Design a protein around this nucleic acid. Structure first.
Lengths: 290, 43, 265
RNA sequence: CUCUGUUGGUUCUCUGUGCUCUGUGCUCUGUUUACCAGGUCAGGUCCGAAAGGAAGCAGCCAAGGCAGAGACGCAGAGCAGGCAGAUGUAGCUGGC
């Protein structure tokens, strides 16, 4: 079930005997470059091999009889702890205000229809808000996906102030008694300042609890520049990894938690609103290495 | 490309052949096949 | 850095650290280590160098007139043809270009900008046409006027898609319709940042047209680009040129002693 | 068992009066017809690399077609409603 690069790196150590300190550095350089082909940054891949190096000398891999079964077991348990550990779900209060931010073509409008059906069958009442005004037919896209699940959508006008949006959200959540509020924002870059200063103002007036970042699985080396800019200026408290249906590995989730320190919650496996399952750090541990 | 080939056989048919499919015999099967660009085995 | 002049256990271990970081291979790196251990030589600096030259070897002058330049996405096929037009015009050859990147946006207009700088005429066409038959009119303009070399450009296609690989077979029989001897030289453009995906690409492009030479670009960075070693082992296809930049004069010939020297550093 | 004037009956064509019936001529309108040497031909094909071309069925359209309401020309075969008109009439019975 392993990849091409990790089938020879762990496979050559079988039936040789006891290893030295120079063999550990020769195996860890292969795991460092196996991550770069699985779409992870070079600065995160260098900080990962220095963590496993200190844990290998503590478990004694030099005096062990089987070296291949120890190194493969240390990377499997270190990657599981670096992604989250176990399957953890967000804390549900009396009034929840969630935010869905991301890049262009990541699928923010697709993830907004998935969270509106998963909590509807448990006992919570959802509510959809569309803050996307720059993209044509974006307010019509969430209206068609909101009629499929049965959740009412709130449409925001062109050129509206952040103080006037809060006046309509607190009015509809009192009469119809809605607890879960889902805000869908527009697609913006990390270096663009006029759009990032408007997002920081929208966070100050409303006051959310859980801010989710929708990141794609096909994101390359630029996965560190997005997670650092959205944490210092705005404030990310959660991560979502969409589009895991193709031949993508999904290594962009490792470069996002190393700089922030915040856990990953949900994962998307299909384009349909029914396709949503919790994040398992055991399933992705055999996909990046496989 | 299987769906557009099935509609292609129905488009070459008349209004009497669509409402009553049992009248399509050996003389009619060759007219529908040559009009759609298909063979006799496809109809 | 590899310490040359120590014990047998430390020289063979530091050699494995430099080869696997240069994108060599799985069964390719395991074959080199078994040949040095059964040799028995004191001078281990010249022993590994004589084995790596034999793995690569099965001015450079072409076998034919029409050359087919192929490749994938993100390698820079249009950038390699701009370097090959500067090298042959200084010797005494009459070169002519041909555009065949009408599938991608601003691909056929990219070779037109480099063609006015080198004063070499390009055979262009509209957007949405066939790149196979636009190469047929380039062979008829070579035999009638009197030109020496011709370089054909291709579109950005992958090895996984079968619909774009059958379109590549239409370019081979188009040049063979006018002149039965041509094509002779088929060159492939690869990148240095590519891992073990470059081995799967070389096996699919040899089954389609038949490769006789491989070129590698972007060698000026941190990547060494030693993905050329497992190709000459199974398929027996030699290496032609190396690219050390983005400029027109940045093209040096293949030296089997200078490529091994920069690989171990 | 002279013919005449008012006056009476058949078998002629006919010429005009306007009707009515049929064929048409063709035309108008409703309806009818899978392929079997019409026109245009969506898809779907084929020929090509393409640019650009071809066959070609549905439909429709035309042409064949089936019937009536048409102004009527052109015409024959029909009756009884017509005051009644034009050159002969032949037989039988009358009335003048």
């Amino acid at each position: 079930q392993l990849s091409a690069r990790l089938q020879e790196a762990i496979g050559r150590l079988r039936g040789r005997g006891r290893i030295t300190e120079e063999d550990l550095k020769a195996t860890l350089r292969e795991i460092r470059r196996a991550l770069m082909d699985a779409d992870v940054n070079l600065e995160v891949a260098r900080d990962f091999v220095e963590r496993v190096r200190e844990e290998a000398l503590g478990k004694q891999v030099l005096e062990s009889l089987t070296p291949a079964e120890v190194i493969l077991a240390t990377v499997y348990e270190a990657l599981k702890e670096a992604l989250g550990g176990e399957a953890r779900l967000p804390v549900l209060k009396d009034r929840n205000l969630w935010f869905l931010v991301g890049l262009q073509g990541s699928g923010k409008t697709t993830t907004a229809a998935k969270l509106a059906l998963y909590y509807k069958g448990k006992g919570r009442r959802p509510l959809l808000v569309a803050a996307d005004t720059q993209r044509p037919a974006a307010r019509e896209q969430l209206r068609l996906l909101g009629e499929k699940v049965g959740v009412p959508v709130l449409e925001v006008m062109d050129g509206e102030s952040p103080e006037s949006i809060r006046r309509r959200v607190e009015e509809k959540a009192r009469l119809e008694a809605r607890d879960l509020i889902l805000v869908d924002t527009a697609g913006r870059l990390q270096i663009d300042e006029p759009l990032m200063g408007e997002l920081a103002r929208l966070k100050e007036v409303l006051g959310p609890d859980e801010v989710l970042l929708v990141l794609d699985a096909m994101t390359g080396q630029e996965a560190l520049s997005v997670a650092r800019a959205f944490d210092e200026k705005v404030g990310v408290t959660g991560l979502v990894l969409t589009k895991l249906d193709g031949d993508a590995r999904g290594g962009a989730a490792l470069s996002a938690r190393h700089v922030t320190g915040k856990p990953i919650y949900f994962a998307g496996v299909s384009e349909k609103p029914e396709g949503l399952e919790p994040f398992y750090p055991e399933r992705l541990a055999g996909r990046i290495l496989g | 490309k299987v769906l557009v080939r099935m509609e292609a056989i129905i488009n070459s048919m008349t209004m009497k052949e669509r409402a009553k499919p049992e009248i399509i015999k050996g003389s009619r099967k060759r007219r529908i096949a040559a009009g759609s660009g298909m063979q006799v085995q496809d109809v | 850095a590899i310490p040359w002049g120590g014990n047998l256990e430390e020289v063979l271990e530091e050699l494995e650290m430099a080869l696997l970081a240069a994108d060599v291979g799985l069964s390719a790196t395991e074959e080199i280590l078994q040949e040095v251990r059964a040799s028995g030589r004191k001078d281990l600096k010249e022993a590994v160098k004589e084995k790596l030259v034999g793995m690569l070897e099965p001015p450079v002058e072409p076998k034919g007139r029409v050359v087919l330049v192929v490749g994938v996405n993100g390698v820079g096929k249009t950038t390699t043809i701009a370097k090959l037009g500067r090298y042959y015009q200084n010797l005494g050859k009459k070169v002519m270009f041909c555009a065949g990147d009408t599938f991608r946006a601003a691909g056929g207009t990219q070779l037109s900008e480099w063609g006015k700088r080198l004063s070499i005429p390009v055979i262009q066409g509209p957007e949405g046409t066939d790149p196979a038959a636009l190469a047929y009119d380039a062979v008829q303009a070579m035999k009638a006027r009197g030109y020496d070399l011709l370089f054909v450009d291709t579109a950005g296609r992958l090895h996984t898609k079968h619909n774009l690989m059958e379109e590549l077979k239409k370019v081979k029989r188009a040049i063979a319709k006018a002149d039965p001897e041509e094509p002779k030289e088929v060159w492939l453009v690869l990148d240095a940042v590519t891992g073990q995906n470059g081995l799967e690409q070389a096996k699919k492009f040899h089954e389609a047209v038949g490769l006789t030479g491989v070129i590698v670009t972007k060698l000026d960075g941190t990547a060494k680009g030693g993905v050329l070693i497992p190709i000459v082992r199974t398929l027996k296809v030699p290496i032609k040129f190396v690219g050390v930049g983005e400029g027109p004069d940045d093209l040096q010939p293949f030296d089997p002693e200078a490529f091994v020297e920069a690989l171990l550093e």
